[PDB]
Write a protein that binds this ligand. Sequence first.
Ligand SMILES: CN1Cc2ccccc2NC1=O
Ligand SMILES: [K+]
Length: 119
Amino acid sequence: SMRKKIFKPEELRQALMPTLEALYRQDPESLPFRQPVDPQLLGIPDYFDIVKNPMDLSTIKRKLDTGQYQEPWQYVDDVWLMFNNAWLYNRKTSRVYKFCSKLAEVFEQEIDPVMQSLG
Ligand SMILES: CN1Cc2ccccc2NC1=O
Ligand SMILES: [K+]
């Protein structure tokens, strides 16, 4: 037989939310990622020409809090979208690129045992 695993939204929140919280706890590194990029406010007006699909911690949080992920990989893909956006837009030598790299490191550490537990 073949049975597709079903994940209830609270199941996903309780497993995955802690991994998001681990990123929020990183200070100063998470501060640029805690709200959607506002190009006008930040003085970076080319941002949306380069980044077509914006993502940030508050959006991911919202989606986890309101049951918008069906599968663990959907949550993971949004986290990587947020990081890949920042690695794409910002220069390798920049503060925000280096902050992104630190958050990705923390994320890789936290997510692996969670993915194993979710199966
Ligand atoms: C996620 N952010 C936020 C940000 C804040 C300040 C300067 C550059 C950026 N670029 C980004 O990619
Ligand atoms: K880049």
